[PDB]
PDB file of C-alpha atoms and ligand atoms in Angstrom:
ATOM      1  CA  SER U   1      -3.398 -14.757  15.099  1.00 54.64           C
ATOM      2  CA  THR U   2      -6.475 -13.841  13.071  1.00 47.76           C
ATOM      3  CA  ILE U   3      -7.931 -10.430  13.902  1.00 49.95           C
ATOM      4  CA  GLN U   4     -10.712  -7.973  13.110  1.00 49.87           C
ATOM      5  CA  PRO U   5      -9.843  -4.590  11.579  1.00 49.77           C
ATOM      6  CA  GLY U   6      -7.489  -2.572  13.734  1.00 49.28           C
ATOM      7  CA  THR U   7      -3.910  -1.512  14.263  1.00 50.37           C
ATOM      8  CA  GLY U   8      -1.183  -2.462  16.670  1.00 51.65           C
ATOM      9  CA  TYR U   9       2.243  -3.982  16.927  1.00 52.12           C
ATOM     10  CA  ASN U  10       2.870  -7.718  16.584  1.00 52.62           C
ATOM     11  CA  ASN U  11       6.309  -9.287  17.041  1.00 57.25           C
ATOM     12  CA  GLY U  12       7.926  -5.902  16.554  1.00 55.26           C
ATOM     13  CA  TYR U  13       6.014  -4.985  13.388  1.00 56.54           C
ATOM     14  CA  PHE U  14       3.225  -2.498  13.150  1.00 57.06           C
ATOM     15  CA  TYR U  15       0.140  -3.821  11.425  1.00 58.89           C
ATOM     16  CA  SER U  16      -2.935  -2.190   9.960  1.00 58.57           C
ATOM     17  CA  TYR U  17      -5.959  -4.102   8.711  1.00 59.65           C
ATOM     18  CA  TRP U  18      -8.931  -2.192   7.328  1.00 62.42           C
ATOM     19  CA  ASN U  19     -12.026  -3.308   5.481  1.00 63.09           C
ATOM     20  CA  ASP U  20     -15.294  -1.765   4.305  1.00 68.69           C
ATOM     21  CA  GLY U  21     -17.443  -3.988   6.510  1.00 67.13           C
ATOM     22  CA  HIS U  22     -18.151  -6.492   3.813  1.00 68.44           C
ATOM     23  CA  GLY U  23     -17.396 -10.068   4.705  1.00 65.71           C
ATOM     24  CA  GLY U  24     -15.137 -12.514   2.978  1.00 65.54           C
ATOM     25  CA  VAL U  25     -11.699 -11.591   4.346  1.00 66.28           C
ATOM     26  CA  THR U  26      -9.490 -13.269   6.922  1.00 66.91           C
ATOM     27  CA  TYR U  27      -6.374 -11.374   8.048  1.00 66.98           C
ATOM     28  CA  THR U  28      -3.795 -13.202  10.192  1.00 69.90           C
ATOM     29  CA  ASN U  29      -0.631 -11.942  11.875  1.00 69.07           C
ATOM     30  CA  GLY U  30       2.116 -14.526  12.075  1.00 69.25           C
ATOM     31  CA  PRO U  31       5.596 -14.782  13.582  1.00 69.63           C
ATOM     32  CA  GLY U  32       8.047 -11.971  13.072  1.00 70.42           C
ATOM     33  CA  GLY U  33       7.250  -9.863  10.036  1.00 70.45           C
ATOM     34  CA  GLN U  34       4.755 -12.348   8.577  1.00 69.87           C
ATOM     35  CA  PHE U  35       1.085 -11.879   7.808  1.00 69.12           C
ATOM     36  CA  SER U  36      -1.412 -13.671   5.630  1.00 66.28           C
ATOM     37  CA  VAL U  37      -4.655 -12.729   3.954  1.00 66.39           C
ATOM     38  CA  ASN U  38      -7.245 -15.157   2.607  1.00 67.42           C
ATOM     39  CA  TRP U  39     -10.321 -13.775   0.919  1.00 66.23           C
ATOM     40  CA  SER U  40     -13.344 -15.037  -0.983  1.00 68.86           C
ATOM     41  CA  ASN U  41     -15.889 -12.691  -2.598  1.00 66.84           C
ATOM     42  CA  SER U  42     -14.622  -9.838  -0.432  1.00 66.23           C
ATOM     43  CA  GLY U  43     -15.425  -6.192  -0.489  1.00 64.48           C
ATOM     44  CA  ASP U  44     -12.710  -3.545  -0.245  1.00 65.80           C
ATOM     45  CA  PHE U  45      -9.861  -4.208   2.216  1.00 66.88           C
ATOM     46  CA  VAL U  46      -6.184  -3.427   2.768  1.00 65.53           C
ATOM     47  CA  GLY U  47      -3.844  -4.771   5.424  1.00 65.13           C
ATOM     48  CA  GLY U  48      -0.318  -5.759   6.261  1.00 64.13           C
ATOM     49  CA  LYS U  49       2.791  -5.261   8.360  1.00 59.48           C
ATOM     50  CA  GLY U  50       5.613  -2.765   8.629  1.00 58.13           C
ATOM     51  CA  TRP U  51       6.397   0.324  10.675  1.00 57.89           C
ATOM     52  CA  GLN U  52       4.697   3.087  12.631  1.00 54.81           C
ATOM     53  CA  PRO U  53       6.139   5.610  12.044  1.00 56.32           C
ATOM     54  CA  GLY U  54       7.732   4.875   8.720  1.00 56.49           C
ATOM     55  CA  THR U  55      10.619   6.875   7.325  1.00 53.24           C
ATOM     56  CA  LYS U  56      11.476   8.719   4.130  1.00 55.59           C
ATOM     57  CA  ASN U  57      14.478   6.526   3.290  1.00 55.70           C
ATOM     58  CA  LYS U  58      13.501   3.037   4.394  1.00 56.69           C
ATOM     59  CA  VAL U  59      14.584   0.071   2.304  1.00 58.32           C
ATOM     60  CA  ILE U  60      11.702  -2.366   2.690  1.00 62.38           C
ATOM     61  CA  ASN U  61      12.130  -6.091   2.044  1.00 61.65           C
ATOM     62  CA  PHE U  62       9.305  -8.549   1.360  1.00 60.40           C
ATOM     63  CA  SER U  63       8.885 -12.123   0.271  1.00 58.36           C
ATOM     64  CA  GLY U  64       6.291 -14.841   0.120  1.00 61.82           C
ATOM     65  CA  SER U  65       3.246 -15.817  -1.898  1.00 63.24           C
ATOM     66  CA  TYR U  66       0.709 -13.570  -3.622  1.00 65.27           C
ATOM     67  CA  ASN U  67      -2.129 -15.240  -5.552  1.00 66.29           C
ATOM     68  CA  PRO U  68      -5.086 -12.967  -6.225  1.00 69.78           C
ATOM     69  CA  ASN U  69      -8.123 -14.056  -8.222  1.00 65.26           C
ATOM     70  CA  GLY U  70      -9.462 -10.697  -9.342  1.00 64.12           C
ATOM     71  CA  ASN U  71      -8.861  -7.120  -8.269  1.00 61.06           C
ATOM     72  CA  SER U  72      -6.004  -6.875  -5.779  1.00 57.53           C
ATOM     73  CA  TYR U  73      -2.578  -5.377  -5.362  1.00 58.16           C
ATOM     74  CA  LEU U  74       0.568  -5.893  -3.315  1.00 57.90           C
ATOM     75  CA  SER U  75       2.295  -2.672  -2.322  1.00 57.93           C
ATOM     76  CA  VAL U  76       4.325  -0.620   0.028  1.00 61.19           C
ATOM     77  CA  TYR U  77       1.530   1.470   1.486  1.00 59.94           C
ATOM     78  CA  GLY U  78       1.605   4.390   3.854  1.00 61.46           C
ATOM     79  CA  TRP U  79       0.546   7.866   4.880  1.00 62.31           C
ATOM     80  CA  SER U  80       1.902  11.204   5.889  1.00 61.39           C
ATOM     81  CA  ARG U  81       0.191  13.921   7.905  1.00 61.65           C
ATOM     82  CA  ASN U  82       0.331  17.700   7.628  1.00 58.94           C
ATOM     83  CA  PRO U  83      -0.212  17.392   4.750  1.00 59.94           C
ATOM     84  CA  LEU U  84      -2.310  14.248   4.585  1.00 59.05           C
ATOM     85  CA  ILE U  85      -1.024  11.993   1.790  1.00 59.25           C
ATOM     86  CA  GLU U  86      -1.812   8.381   0.975  1.00 59.13           C
ATOM     87  CA  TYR U  87       0.793   6.556  -1.115  1.00 61.26           C
ATOM     88  CA  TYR U  88       1.288   3.189  -2.793  1.00 60.99           C
ATOM     89  CA  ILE U  89       4.378   1.643  -4.365  1.00 63.97           C
ATOM     90  CA  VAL U  90       2.658  -1.202  -6.198  1.00 65.63           C
ATOM     91  CA  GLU U  91       4.824  -4.271  -6.804  1.00 64.16           C
ATOM     92  CA  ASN U  92       2.168  -6.594  -8.227  1.00 64.57           C
ATOM     93  CA  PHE U  93      -1.537  -6.511  -9.036  1.00 66.77           C
ATOM     94  CA  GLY U  94      -4.379  -8.702 -10.277  1.00 65.09           C
ATOM     95  CA  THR U  95      -7.052  -7.996 -12.872  1.00 66.71           C
ATOM     96  CA  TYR U  96      -7.148  -4.177 -12.587  1.00 66.77           C
ATOM     97  CA  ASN U  97      -4.386  -1.599 -12.727  1.00 66.18           C
ATOM     98  CA  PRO U  98      -5.037   0.441  -9.557  1.00 66.13           C
ATOM     99  CA  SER U  99      -3.545   3.611 -11.059  1.00 64.39           C
ATOM    100  CA  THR U 100      -6.468   3.738 -13.524  1.00 63.05           C
ATOM    101  CA  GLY U 101      -7.998   7.181 -13.399  1.00 61.69           C
ATOM    102  CA  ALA U 102      -4.961   8.774 -11.756  1.00 62.33           C
ATOM    103  CA  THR U 103      -2.793  11.326 -13.564  1.00 62.06           C
ATOM    104  CA  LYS U 104       0.585  10.123 -14.783  1.00 62.00           C
ATOM    105  CA  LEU U 105       3.439  12.281 -13.495  1.00 62.83           C
ATOM    106  CA  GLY U 106       6.365  10.492 -15.130  1.00 64.55           C
ATOM    107  CA  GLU U 107       8.518   7.426 -14.513  1.00 65.66           C
ATOM    108  CA  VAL U 108      11.203   6.313 -12.060  1.00 67.27           C
ATOM    109  CA  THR U 109      13.592   3.369 -12.144  1.00 65.09           C
ATOM    110  CA  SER U 110      14.154   1.554  -8.878  1.00 63.88           C
ATOM    111  CA  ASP U 111      15.114  -1.902  -7.688  1.00 64.07           C
ATOM    112  CA  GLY U 112      15.215  -3.510 -11.123  1.00 65.54           C
ATOM    113  CA  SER U 113      12.179  -2.005 -12.846  1.00 64.13           C
ATOM    114  CA  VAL U 114      10.739   1.109 -14.349  1.00 65.35           C
ATOM    115  CA  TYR U 115       7.692   2.375 -12.460  1.00 62.33           C
ATOM    116  CA  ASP U 116       5.010   4.744 -13.722  1.00 62.13           C
ATOM    117  CA  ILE U 117       4.143   7.432 -11.148  1.00 61.87           C
ATOM    118  CA  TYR U 118       0.738   9.025 -10.698  1.00 61.45           C
ATOM    119  CA  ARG U 119      -1.432  11.031  -8.386  1.00 58.36           C
ATOM    120  CA  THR U 120      -5.102  11.700  -7.881  1.00 58.80           C
ATOM    121  CA  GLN U 121      -7.190  13.626  -5.361  1.00 57.64           C
ATOM    122  CA  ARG U 122      -9.430  11.617  -3.029  1.00 58.09           C
ATOM    123  CA  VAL U 123     -12.443  13.621  -1.847  1.00 57.54           C
ATOM    124  CA  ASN U 124     -14.370  12.829   1.361  1.00 58.40           C
ATOM    125  CA  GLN U 125     -12.867   9.341   1.591  1.00 57.86           C
ATOM    126  CA  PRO U 126     -11.800   7.168   4.531  1.00 58.53           C
ATOM    127  CA  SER U 127      -8.369   7.930   5.929  1.00 59.15           C
ATOM    128  CA  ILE U 128      -6.196   7.674   9.001  1.00 59.18           C
ATOM    129  CA  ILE U 129      -7.854  10.898  10.255  1.00 58.27           C
ATOM    130  CA  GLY U 130     -11.420   9.993   9.366  1.00 60.65           C
ATOM    131  CA  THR U 131     -13.354  11.193   6.344  1.00 59.63           C
ATOM    132  CA  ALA U 132     -10.958  13.487   4.527  1.00 61.71           C
ATOM    133  CA  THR U 133      -9.702  14.933   1.280  1.00 61.93           C
ATOM    134  CA  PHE U 134      -6.119  14.243   0.281  1.00 62.52           C
ATOM    135  CA  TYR U 135      -3.810  13.471  -2.590  1.00 61.77           C
ATOM    136  CA  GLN U 136      -3.043   9.834  -3.268  1.00 62.41           C
ATOM    137  CA  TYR U 137       0.244   8.967  -4.951  1.00 61.79           C
ATOM    138  CA  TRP U 138       1.095   5.852  -6.925  1.00 62.06           C
ATOM    139  CA  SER U 139       4.236   4.252  -8.279  1.00 60.54           C
ATOM    140  CA  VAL U 140       3.357   1.121 -10.282  1.00 57.27           C
ATOM    141  CA  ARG U 141       6.064  -1.404 -11.060  1.00 58.96           C
ATOM    142  CA  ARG U 142       6.128  -2.531 -14.675  1.00 59.45           C
ATOM    143  CA  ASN U 143       7.895  -5.837 -13.958  1.00 58.05           C
ATOM    144  CA  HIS U 144       5.538  -7.375 -11.411  1.00 59.24           C
ATOM    145  CA  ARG U 145       6.943  -9.385  -8.533  1.00 58.46           C
ATOM    146  CA  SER U 146       5.980 -10.872  -5.179  1.00 59.98           C
ATOM    147  CA  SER U 147       9.383 -10.665  -3.457  1.00 60.18           C
ATOM    148  CA  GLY U 148      11.854  -7.815  -3.511  1.00 57.19           C
ATOM    149  CA  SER U 149      13.347  -4.791  -1.872  1.00 56.54           C
ATOM    150  CA  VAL U 150      11.956  -1.293  -2.288  1.00 55.85           C
ATOM    151  CA  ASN U 151      14.102   1.802  -1.816  1.00 56.55           C
ATOM    152  CA  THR U 152      11.281   4.116  -0.817  1.00 55.88           C
ATOM    153  CA  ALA U 153      13.446   7.212  -1.209  1.00 55.04           C
ATOM    154  CA  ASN U 154      13.571   6.769  -4.987  1.00 54.28           C
ATOM    155  CA  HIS U 155       9.783   6.931  -5.152  1.00 53.68           C
ATOM    156  CA  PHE U 156       9.420   9.791  -2.679  1.00 53.57           C
ATOM    157  CA  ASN U 157      12.012  11.788  -4.650  1.00 54.42           C
ATOM    158  CA  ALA U 158      10.322  11.106  -7.987  1.00 55.03           C
ATOM    159  CA  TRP U 159       6.990  12.263  -6.592  1.00 53.14           C
ATOM    160  CA  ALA U 160       8.590  15.323  -4.988  1.00 54.88           C
ATOM    161  CA  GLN U 161       9.953  16.433  -8.353  1.00 52.22           C
ATOM    162  CA  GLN U 162       6.342  16.812  -9.553  1.00 50.77           C
ATOM    163  CA  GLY U 163       5.060  18.573  -6.440  1.00 52.39           C
ATOM    164  CA  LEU U 164       4.716  16.145  -3.515  1.00 54.40           C
ATOM    165  CA  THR U 165       5.456  17.625  -0.107  1.00 50.79           C
ATOM    166  CA  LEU U 166       5.631  14.731   2.327  1.00 50.83           C
ATOM    167  CA  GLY U 167       4.621  15.707   5.808  1.00 49.77           C
ATOM    168  CA  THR U 168       5.159  13.754   8.987  1.00 47.70           C
ATOM    169  CA  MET U 169       5.369  10.046   8.250  1.00 50.57           C
ATOM    170  CA  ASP U 170       2.616   7.867   9.680  1.00 51.71           C
ATOM    171  CA  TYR U 171       2.440   4.123   9.095  1.00 52.60           C
ATOM    172  CA  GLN U 172       4.351   2.399   6.306  1.00 53.00           C
ATOM    173  CA  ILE U 173       3.547  -1.243   5.568  1.00 53.21           C
ATOM    174  CA  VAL U 174       3.679  -3.938   2.959  1.00 47.58           C
ATOM    175  CA  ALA U 175       0.009  -4.417   2.278  1.00 44.76           C
ATOM    176  CA  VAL U 176      -2.331  -6.681   0.401  1.00 45.49           C
ATOM    177  CA  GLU U 177      -5.423  -4.961  -0.988  1.00 45.97           C
ATOM    178  CA  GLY U 178      -8.476  -6.575  -2.483  1.00 45.66           C
ATOM    179  CA  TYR U 179     -11.532  -5.128  -4.174  1.00 49.25           C
ATOM    180  CA  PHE U 180     -14.522  -7.463  -4.657  1.00 50.97           C
ATOM    181  CA  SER U 181     -12.356 -10.487  -5.363  1.00 49.94           C
ATOM    182  CA  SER U 182     -10.788 -13.629  -3.936  1.00 47.57           C
ATOM    183  CA  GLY U 183      -7.201 -14.609  -3.248  1.00 46.29           C
ATOM    184  CA  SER U 184      -4.523 -15.537  -0.823  1.00 48.54           C
ATOM    185  CA  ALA U 185      -1.227 -14.034   0.221  1.00 47.76           C
ATOM    186  CA  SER U 186       1.442 -14.872   2.788  1.00 49.85           C
ATOM    187  CA  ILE U 187       4.066 -12.135   3.081  1.00 49.27           C
ATOM    188  CA  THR U 188       7.078 -11.655   5.350  1.00 50.04           C
ATOM    189  CA  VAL U 189       8.327  -8.092   5.837  1.00 55.09           C
ATOM    190  CA  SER U 190      11.717  -6.887   7.059  1.00 55.42           C
TER     191      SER U 190
HETATM  192  O1  LIG E 201     -11.226   3.817  12.772  1.00 53.99           O
HETATM  193  C1  LIG E 201     -10.520   4.648  11.871  1.00 53.99           C
HETATM  194  C2  LIG E 201      -9.967   3.641  10.785  1.00 53.99           C
HETATM  195  O2  LIG E 201     -11.021   2.966  10.107  1.00 53.99           O
HETATM  196  C3  LIG E 201      -9.081   4.398   9.831  1.00 53.99           C
HETATM  197  O3  LIG E 201      -8.454   3.476   8.983  1.00 53.99           O
HETATM  198  C4  LIG E 201      -8.011   3.958   7.756  1.00 53.99           C
HETATM  199  C5  LIG E 201      -9.168   4.252   6.819  1.00 53.99           C
HETATM  200  O4  LIG E 201      -8.674   4.503   5.467  1.00 53.99           O
HETATM  201  C6  LIG E 201      -7.995   3.326   4.929  1.00 53.99           C
HETATM  202  O5  LIG E 201      -7.684   3.633   3.672  1.00 53.99           O
HETATM  203  C7  LIG E 201      -7.497   2.998   2.874  1.00 53.99           C
HETATM  204  C8  LIG E 201      -7.705   4.508   2.234  1.00 53.99           C
HETATM  205  O6  LIG E 201      -7.829   4.110   0.796  1.00 53.99           O
HETATM  206  C9  LIG E 201      -8.205   3.071   0.126  1.00 53.99           C
HETATM  207  O7  LIG E 201      -6.882   3.214  -0.393  1.00 53.99           O
HETATM  208  C10 LIG E 201      -8.159   2.316   1.279  1.00 53.99           C
HETATM  209  O8  LIG E 201      -8.874   1.360   0.434  1.00 53.99           O
HETATM  210  C11 LIG E 201      -8.947   3.028   2.385  1.00 53.99           C
HETATM  211  O9  LIG E 201      -9.803   2.312   3.033  1.00 53.99           O
HETATM  212  C12 LIG E 201      -6.786   3.046   5.708  1.00 53.99           C
HETATM  213  O10 LIG E 201      -6.171   1.851   5.208  1.00 53.99           O
HETATM  214  C13 LIG E 201      -7.093   2.860   7.205  1.00 53.99           C
HETATM  215  O11 LIG E 201      -5.843   2.795   7.884  1.00 53.99           O
HETATM  216  O12 LIG E 201      -8.058   4.997  10.558  1.00 53.99           O
HETATM  217  C14 LIG E 201      -8.682   6.102  11.394  1.00 53.99           C
HETATM  218  C15 LIG E 201      -9.426   5.336  12.460  1.00 53.99           C
HETATM  219  O13 LIG E 201      -9.995   6.423  13.286  1.00 53.99           O
HETATM  220  O1  XYP E 202      18.392  -4.069 -14.567  1.00 54.90           O
HETATM  221  C1  XYP E 202      17.233  -3.308 -14.476  1.00 54.90           C
HETATM  222  C2  XYP E 202      16.587  -3.098 -15.849  1.00 54.90           C
HETATM  223  O2  XYP E 202      16.256  -4.348 -16.198  1.00 54.90           O
HETATM  224  C3  XYP E 202      15.402  -2.313 -15.452  1.00 54.90           C
HETATM  225  O3  XYP E 202      14.653  -1.723 -16.513  1.00 54.90           O
HETATM  226  O4  XYP E 202      15.580  -0.985 -15.039  1.00 54.90           O
HETATM  227  C4  XYP E 202      16.307  -1.239 -13.799  1.00 54.90           C
HETATM  228  C5  XYP E 202      17.610  -1.937 -13.789  1.00 54.90           C
HETATM  229  O5  XYP E 202      18.169  -1.898 -12.423  1.00 54.90           O
END
């Protein structure tokens, strides 16, 4: 069903839904691995379904519809702890490349596309442990898609070769993000 920001498990899938308190977003958990997001003149939000804890070698499958009107991205999204790391494997995006401003670390080929990899430091920003400072890693698919399989290990290894130490895995989801935009998405994770 439709829910306010929070976390939990639904039909065997962890979910996380976060927003900045601005209105304009509706997040719905559906059967199995399915979730939907519908948004209209939103603020900042990110939510979706997957695993808690994730793993360092998961192959993540997703399919469905992704139709942003503005700034948004569809990604494998997760965290580690000790050290705190936020990471995104971006499969598709809207009007803004979310790696803008991050430092390019190289490239990796995975699951049918080259990806550009990046990192940046986030300072006194929201996180799974509260306001915190942490590195944020990106791997941005060149050949955008809204269904696919992601071998997360290829991305973790590419980042590690440029200095990532992944700590203890926290959640790991397929997420839809929006940033002052509109859109819809209906995604099934497995
Ligand atoms: O109540 C606390 C939650 O609000 C908190 O949720 C996390 C807050 O950070 C969210 O981060 C996304 C971090 O980066 C941009 O990439 C995202 O836009 C931030 O908002 C994260 O998605 C939430 O899980 O968890 C701790 C709770 O105590
Ligand atoms: O076939 C794919 C090629 O098209 C892509 O660039 O790099 C990945 C391969 O698996």
